[PDB]
Amino acid sequence: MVSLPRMVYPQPKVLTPCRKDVLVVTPWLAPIVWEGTFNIDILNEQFRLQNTTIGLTVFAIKKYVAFLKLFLETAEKHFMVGHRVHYYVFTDQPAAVPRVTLGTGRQLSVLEVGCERRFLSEVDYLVCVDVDMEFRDHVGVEILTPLFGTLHPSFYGSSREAFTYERRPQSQAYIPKDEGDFYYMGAFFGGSVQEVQRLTRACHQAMMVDQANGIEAVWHDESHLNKYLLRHKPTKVLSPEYLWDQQLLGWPAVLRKLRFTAVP
Numbered sequence: 001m002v003s004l005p006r007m008v009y010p011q012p013k014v015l016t017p018c019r020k021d022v023l024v025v026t027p028w029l030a031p032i033v034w035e036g037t038f039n040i041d042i043l044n045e046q047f048r049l050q051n052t053t054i055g056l057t058v059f060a061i062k063k064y065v066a067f068l069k070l071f072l073e074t075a076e077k078h079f080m081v082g083h084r085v086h087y088y089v090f091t092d093q094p095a096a097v098p099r100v101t102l103g104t105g106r107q108l109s110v111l112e113v114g115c116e117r118r119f120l121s122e123v124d125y126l127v128c129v130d131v132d133m134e135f136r137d138h139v140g141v142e143i144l145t146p147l148f149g150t151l152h153p154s155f156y157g158s159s160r161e162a163f164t165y166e167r168r169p170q171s172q173a174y175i176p177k178d179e180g181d182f183y184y185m186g187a188f189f190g191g192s193v194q195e196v197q198r199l200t201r202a203c204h205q206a207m208m209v210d211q212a213n214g215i216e217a218v219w220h221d222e223s224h225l226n227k228y229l230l231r232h233k234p235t236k237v238l239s240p241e242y243l244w245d246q247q248l249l250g251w252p253a254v255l256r257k258l259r260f261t262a263v264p
């Protein structure tokens with residue numbers, strides 16, 4: 001909206017590819033976010049000028065409440081630093097949530113589980129992740145867009161036939177062998193509040209239909225997420241830098257940074 005201020009940075013090079021080892025744009029022209037493709041200073045300016053507020057939702061039930069301290073502490077160091085952040089921790093153990101010190105402009109709300117209209121008035125974007133993870137490097141506004149999915153670390157180099165999509169036609173999450181762009185992991189997705197609510201409503205309804213027909217998608221929520229993103233292309237796709245498991249997969253040359261990883 002408002003004009004950007006004067007900024008001094010390296011001129012983009014039209015005749016020099018960002019990466020010669022990976023795909024940086026999808027066939028529907030959505031950027032695939034890898035280190036080396038973006039200038040965070042320009043993006044920070046764009047989103048700060050709009051006073052962007054990002055909501056980060058996480059579910060911590062039962063023994064998973066134990067992962068909250070590390071999750072929140074590292075998010076404080078690497079997640080959307082400089083921007084307004086609102087953490088939403090859904091848990092069955094409110095008193096078990098650790099008291100983590102937050103930077104200015106950042107807040108945390110504990111919601112006990114046993115209205116979505118709130119999200120629409122409190123944040124601009126919603127980022128939904130799993131709690132048994134830790135941030136190890138920058139995860140910022142470069143990911144914000146109407147709707148985004150993240151490439152699963154175990155399948156980014158696999159052919160669609162190898163993807164573990166739901167293959168039974170009796171399921172609403174069904175995807176045949178000749179269809180599919182990527183295999184997105186259910187542990188990291190998001191977008192505008194509106195698009196995220198549309199996705200969750202669609203998946204919830206599809207799961208109810210499957211339940212009524214006596215069938216459960218092979219990878220549950222993740223299977224439905226993949227079916228949804230197949231039919232509603234994400235406006236940005238995050239590379240595996242954003243969802244990794246170093247103990248299981250190491251640190252391949254294709255990853256210049258490991259930003260958000262599984263906790264052993």
Ligand SMILES: CCCCCCO[C@@H]1O[C@H](CO)[C@H](O)C[C@H]1O[C@@H]1O[C@@H](C)[C@@H](O)[C@@H](O)[C@@H]1O
Binds near residue numbers: 154244245248262
């Ligand atoms: C030692 C076990 C290897 C699992 C590799 C494949 O990852 C799994 O993929 C399915 C869908 O096919 C689903 O997404 C769960 C996922 O496993 C989780 O994520 C991987 C990356 C590891 O961190 C596992 O420990 C997780 O359980």
Ligand SMILES: [Hg+2]
Binds near residue numbers: 017038
């Ligand atoms: Hg570049």
Ligand SMILES: [Hg+2]
Binds near residue numbers: 057126127128196
């Ligand atoms: Hg969410």
Ligand SMILES: [Hg+2]
Binds near residue numbers: 203204206224225227
């Ligand atoms: Hg769905």
Ligand SMILES: [Hg+2]
Binds near residue numbers: 203204222224225
């Ligand atoms: Hg979903």
